[PDB]
Amino acid sequence: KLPGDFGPPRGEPIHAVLTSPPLVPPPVNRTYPAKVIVELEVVEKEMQISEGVSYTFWTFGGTVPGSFIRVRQGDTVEFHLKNHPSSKMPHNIDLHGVTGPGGGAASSFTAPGHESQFTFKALNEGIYVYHCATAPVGMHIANGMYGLILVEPPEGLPKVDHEYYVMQGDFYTAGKYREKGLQPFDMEKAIDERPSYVLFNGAEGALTGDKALHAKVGETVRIFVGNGGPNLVSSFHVIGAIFDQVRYEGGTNVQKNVNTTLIPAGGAAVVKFTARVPGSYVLVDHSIFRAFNKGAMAILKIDGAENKLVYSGKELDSVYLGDRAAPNMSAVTKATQASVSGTLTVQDQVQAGRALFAGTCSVCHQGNGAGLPGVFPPLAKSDFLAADPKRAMNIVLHGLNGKIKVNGQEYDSVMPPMTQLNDDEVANILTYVLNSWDNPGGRVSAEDVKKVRAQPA
Amino acid sequence: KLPGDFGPPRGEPIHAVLTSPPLVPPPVNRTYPAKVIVELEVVEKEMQISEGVSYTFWTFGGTVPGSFIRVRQGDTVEFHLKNHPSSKMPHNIDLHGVTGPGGGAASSFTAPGHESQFTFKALNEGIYVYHCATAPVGMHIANGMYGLILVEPPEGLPKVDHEYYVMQGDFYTAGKYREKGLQPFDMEKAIDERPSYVLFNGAEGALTGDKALHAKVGETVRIFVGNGGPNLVSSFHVIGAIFDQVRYEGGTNVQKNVNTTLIPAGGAAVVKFTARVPGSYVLVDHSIFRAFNKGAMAILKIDGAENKLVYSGKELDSVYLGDRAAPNMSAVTKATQASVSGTLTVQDQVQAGRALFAGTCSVCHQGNGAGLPGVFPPLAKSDFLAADPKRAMNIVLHGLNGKIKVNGQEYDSVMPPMTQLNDDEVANILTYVLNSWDNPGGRVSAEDVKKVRAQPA
Amino acid sequence: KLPGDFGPPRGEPIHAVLTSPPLVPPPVNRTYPAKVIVELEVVEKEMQISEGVSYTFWTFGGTVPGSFIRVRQGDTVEFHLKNHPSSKMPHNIDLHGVTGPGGGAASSFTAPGHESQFTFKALNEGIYVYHCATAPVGMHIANGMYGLILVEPPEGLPKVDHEYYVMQGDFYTAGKYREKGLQPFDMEKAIDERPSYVLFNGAEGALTGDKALHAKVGETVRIFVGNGGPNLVSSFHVIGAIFDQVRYEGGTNVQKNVNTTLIPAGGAAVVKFTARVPGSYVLVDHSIFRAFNKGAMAILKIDGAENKLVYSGKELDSVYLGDRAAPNMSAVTKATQASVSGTLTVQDQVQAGRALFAGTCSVCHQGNGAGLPGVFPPLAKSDFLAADPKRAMNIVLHGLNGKIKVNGQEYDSVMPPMTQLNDDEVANILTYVLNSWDNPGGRVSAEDVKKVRAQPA
């Protein structure tokens, strides 16, 4: 016998209903094998990879990751791939759930404005990555061409309260992290496995703030977690919790009660979480500079009653989550647009800088700029800041150490350099500070910052 | 008790028969522990890491990976290491199957033209990496000094139709990927874990085309898969199939029905595959730029009857496999040699360029250069190409976008830059195109391309 | 039920006794849940990351990794974090054993000279990483802020002869590996995941030589192995042995009889080893250039009777272990200090160079400088060396090949470049050689070497 030997397809042909991340199609809830017709369309389009940063994504179904496909082991799948006429590249597909050469690739080659099809039997239960298989394969995957297909076991997966769809990827821009504008793909960084962004669901903030996943205390949550790569292996972790279960692909092994689990490039897992106490739980790649410096953080927010017997402490804030603690960073997108249009106002900068100040500066200087007398100097009503705004630009870029006097008190500490901030980020942050807390107002421009970066003090 | 406690060696001393990759010695097929004499000789020698690219490998037995060693748990192994007189370096061995300091390293230190020996009991069943353990350890491993030893369980492994031997490694050349000539080892790239090549069995194409592994529909295939490193962890994957079973080293755990499995640097696994439908199945590191831009692809070709109930589609082609779809790329080796000798002909370039055009250019321009009217412009009988061969060199290196007219039709698309191609590759590709499809002939030299690369348009 | 449902805390409140690496607190040895009070203090301080190389570590309890915490599943833990007044940064904690947002992070935020506390129930047995969770999170982790907490199962872990505590981390210095002085943290290398050092227990040599772990033939050894990252995944391996068992975090899965095991960034495992034959067993990251070029090696030294039936060979030496075969490299620290003070003597250089010569040079030239006639030239009484000390500096930095005559014999071989050695290392090595084996004496300075490095021959 082949696996999946449940006889020929029966009942009526089923047009598959595909979902956009982070949502999942309903359970198939069927006891017979079917012919399932899947229709997926490739679209190439600009979208925001971060606030004010555009990227030309190549997508299955208009999203990164691509549309979720849900079938039953033993189904016959008639797979139709369309390539939107606006596409410049040809595309195809390899689904890891397919038994046969290229996982579908040779039969699915599709030029702009064309359609292809092929048929396969889903012999193997499991969660599987699919992706584009068009030379150069890495460029297509890097541009967002990956998703998940779930092949359910015949009896279905156990019932849970919520199912979600999260997929990591590594991205390669010409520009540095959070450098604004339309950023080209960078082949040299890709070949060197040196990504500028590492994301869940194709954007910074795709699953944070007002885009978080939700559940309640007591509920069970299943997450279908993929790693599209192209290159990185995820040290996949939930901050503040444990996974009840982790199962990779269609593997027989199930691990229980684990916190950190390695998902190979091209791999996928099904994780289960039980919500025990309220708050924000962070999905990360625990290769920490990915999660905290490249975008690899997503949120599952649990509503419900505190249990002080289990955890006496407070919800996550900007100390840990940084600028992603807030509902969104829309002001950054607005100020970037206004720079482009040539209509950038002081208030546009202030609201952008407000968003960026959280975590980045507030961890030491506090959210109200007060600092901590003799330990962290104030930015609120700060004589030192007012006395020399160019020096303040140098301090953000290049750091500051040694004895200073601020508002009549001595400090003798160290502020690390923050050179990774872009010229517009420094300018907007300092403009926010100057227009808050009885400081003198005015503004700092990105051009002001560019000059200080080129000639440090 | 120690493990492996099967009493003293009995019968006659056995001179081990060692195999070159990708082949495996026969099952030991024995019910008693034996003294097994293993004789392995280190050879330092130039060989082709890619077509027209030489590298000084350091080998166990003249191959990368080194000769396969097959023994039975509870055997006494008398290990003899010889260092060929032509060697410049001393060498030794650490076998992961050895219980004792250095896995054999101090007792196996061997200068050029010398021999060493030591004895160990094989206490632990499993598949194990062996490698050189001579300071600087990473340089020796990087130059190819690794292989596998199988310590069988007492009753033997279950019978299969085929057994094969595949080992991944990361390689560090001074030159870039596919830059021709004798390439020195590059310590700086090695320390930074930035390999120029990532290979199965010591060369690009070692297991592709006319060097593929073979089996038939219905047959079972066991592959002993090693990762010699030195530095990379493999996201080891079979395109178009699943592994029936994966077992690491001598581990008790066996995973079944998995597609993607992480093999640590220095690790090894036994995988099993059942062939269900015909075609080419690709073993890759699914850190995708390794498999598709650095050489990390191998083929298992399955012969037999199509099963349209399982897979309705076509065999792998150059869209996915690129220039490795073909039986070999011997023409590239020939043209490189002819450049060195100073006898490079137009036809030498044409045949090299023919090989390199597959996938690289044909994915968009087609294998016959026809393109797709109004979508991908033709290279066949192309007025645009003929009008300006220097512009064509600039297009390959630096890309092309915007409105053009080719053979009377408008195109308004994007051809990405292909800067990673070497000067000789661009020159040979364009020479092929110029001497095909009623184009004007002539040639492009690598020196022509070098000048365009230095001064883009 | 929640897990850990063993009723309210009983008996007396327990003040936890925390241990410094590589030691572990005693088993809890208790049948009832307790309130456990944990007091941990953050200290920022300079310490030696390698001989003569200082780094400002940020520590939990004054060590890297931080103090080990041992509790029982179902305990109520009242966690107190203090920040020493000498600190310049604020700090907090995320323990992977905590159920709740941030693993404790928001409730543990602590400015210099302050204290925080929070309470949590230990619901989940297992070994878990804890680390600082203060923006920028990666900088805090990179500076050493991580450790382990063991939550025992209710019945305790099985008894063993020895328990040890080892934790890997990746470190990012401005300077290159073994470049002397106080080295700043390097954010750019951290973001790129390009560490200068990869260590066990916060320093080169922390667990080698006269700092090795110990046990005897026949004994069982449990090691709690953490990977603090921030970024790297360890291909964790014991040279010369196998792990009886490996269990990750609180996972249900236990793997037996494995040699190489991948520990995620932020992950932890419990490994068990049975000592069968005497000698030095090396714990490494088998991403080999980490273990042999960046510091990622630790030793478990087993005392007891040889068993020639199992292993006929010799203890580890400098061929494999390099300069870490020796009890320590204190002379390097002394000579560095003397350079700083301006009191560097010839004998200070000689003793430093003696330490550095082991492995690095002795693998080919022997520990007595004799070489191997016609294969490796002598450094002992070497006419060639004496004739031109500047040439000798060029040879170490830039290599040597081709025919030479040394002490009346021809050599026609290759000495690779050793450019990664720092100016002081080359100077001290050559000073050692010049003042040994009837060579002419005198000295080479680091300034002499700096000039040759800038103008190769």
Ligand code: HEC
């Ligand atoms: C803690 C790690 C810090 C973060 C994050 C930021 N700053 Fe800071 N800042 C810090 C210290 C300890 C000091 C004093 C250093 C010394 O020599 O003692 C400073 C100083 C400033 C100043 C000048 C003094 C004042 O006006 O209060 C400015 C203008 C300043 N810092 C701004 C600033 C901004 C805008 C930040 C986010 C980009 C930021 N700091 C982060 C400590 C820390």
Ligand code: HEC
């Ligand atoms: C699809 C991704 C492409 C690959 C791979 C290659 N080329 Fe291409 N090419 C492509 C397009 C869409 C265009 C037109 C761009 C525009 O502005 O509309 C081109 C154009 C050329 C041309 C000039 C026009 C012509 O003569 O047809 C040349 C000479 C050309 N391409 C050559 C070429 C070669 C040799 C390739 C492999 C190295 C190659 N192209 C790849 C799309 C694609």
Ligand code: HEC
């Ligand atoms: C084997 C891999 C080597 C290591 C490690 C080192 N050296 Fe070496 N050395 C080696 C060879 C094969 C040769 C001769 C090369 C040739 O052209 O045939 C050398 C030569 C030297 C010399 C000059 C000759 C002599 O005086 O014997 C010097 C001074 C020398 N080597 C020094 C040296 C030092 C100090 C090393 C550690 C830093 C070192 N060598 C390593 C082979 C090897």
Ligand SMILES: [Cu+2]
């Ligand atoms: Cu595509």
Ligand SMILES: [Cu+2]
């Ligand atoms: Cu794939």
Ligand SMILES: [Cu+2]
């Ligand atoms: Cu060797």
Ligand SMILES: [Cu+2]
């Ligand atoms: Cu090894």
Ligand SMILES: [Cu+2]
């Ligand atoms: Cu901290």
Ligand SMILES: [Cu+2]
């Ligand atoms: Cu963590």
